[PDB]
Amino acid sequence: DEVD
Amino acid sequence: NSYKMDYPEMGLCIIINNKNFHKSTGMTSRSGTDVDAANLRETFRNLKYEVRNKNDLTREEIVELMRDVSKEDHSKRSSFVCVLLSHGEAGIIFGTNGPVDLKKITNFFRGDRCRSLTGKPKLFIIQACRGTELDCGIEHKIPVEADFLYAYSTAPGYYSWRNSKDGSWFIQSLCAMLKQYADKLEFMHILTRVNRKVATEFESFSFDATFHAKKQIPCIHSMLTKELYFY
């Protein structure tokens, strides 16, 4: 899980 | 009451897939975005859209592409779809070398600026952050702005989540719901199913407590004037  | 989807062509589906950014921008590579892009390509291909994938476009290339597409003759096309996969901020999506205003992009397709799309649904699907908030969860005849729909992956002000292996929560859910329901549900109802899927089935896992156990709700902005059916 990563943020954009 | 339903948009005419009876034209010889369903329309264009432009997919802008920005994965790698210029070092100077300091933006991270968006691992998992290729999975999104291929998933959307196949999904929209099945709905009989003419898909065009574009990878790693500069802010200048994004504007130029949108200008050129808006200048095409869409007379024989029922609709228009643009999918943007990149970094973002409130009201903004990033080219590989800097930001572009979402308003500048969508403006090319206004009812008065793109005559061959007037009265036709113009769909913008945006997987991008809209700020840095995290959700902890809990227990003239026609207006020029008419017939646009904007399907944002996340609430205004909030980060949007992407899994490096599976793709973004939103695009994963969107393609799945289209595959399952495009032959049976109106588009707003499909997008509502996407909202529920993202809201209920996803939750971040991080070694970093700040980013752990976080949630996401997409946001539909509809200025559509008719129901949209893909069949």
* H/E segment holding residue B44: helix B33-46
Domain at B1-231: CATH architecture: 3-Layer(aba) Sandwich (3.40)
* Cβ(B137)–Cβ(B204) below 8 Å: no
Alpha carbons B111 and B124: distance in angstroms, whole number: 15
Nearest to A1 among B28, B153, B206 (CB): B206
B204 CB neighbours in chain A (<8 A) are 1
Contact of B126 with B152, CB cutoff 8 Å: yes
User: Where are the strands (E) in B46-180, listed by range?
Assistant: 50-55, 77-85, 88-89, 92-95, 98-101, 122-127, 131-133, 148-152, 157-158, 161-163, 167-168
The answer to whether B223 and B149 are in contact (CB under 8 A) is yes
Residues 157-186 of B with CB under 8 A from A: 159-164, 168
Q: Rounded to an integer, what distance in angstroms lies between the CA atom of residue B7 and that of residue B149?
A: 20
Q: How far is B83 from chain A (nearest CA, A)?
A: 15
Cβ–Cβ below 8 Å for A3 and B127: no
Do residues B79 and B11 lie in contact, with contact meaning Cβ atoms separated by under 8 Å? yes
Measure A1 CA to nearest chain B CA, in Å. Answer: 4
Task: Give the chain B residue whose CA is nearest to the CA of A2.
Answer: B162
Within 8 A of B89 by CB-CB distance, chain A residues are none
Helices (H), B47-186: 59-70, 102-107, 169-181
Domain ranges of chain B: 1-231
Opening angle at CA B100, ends B88 and B187, nearest 5: 65
To one decimal, the resolution in angstroms is: 1.8
Q: Are the CB atoms for B214 and B227 separated by under 8 Å?
A: no
Q: Tell me if A2 and B129 make a contact (CB, 8 A cut-off).
A: no
| Token pair 């207006």: residue | B143
Cα separations (Å) of B225 from B118, B147, B148, B222, B228?
A: 12, 6, 9, 9, 9
Q: Taking CB atoms and an 8 Å limit, are A4 and B211 in contact across chains? A: no
> Rounded to 5 degrees, what are φ and ψ at B80?
-150, 135
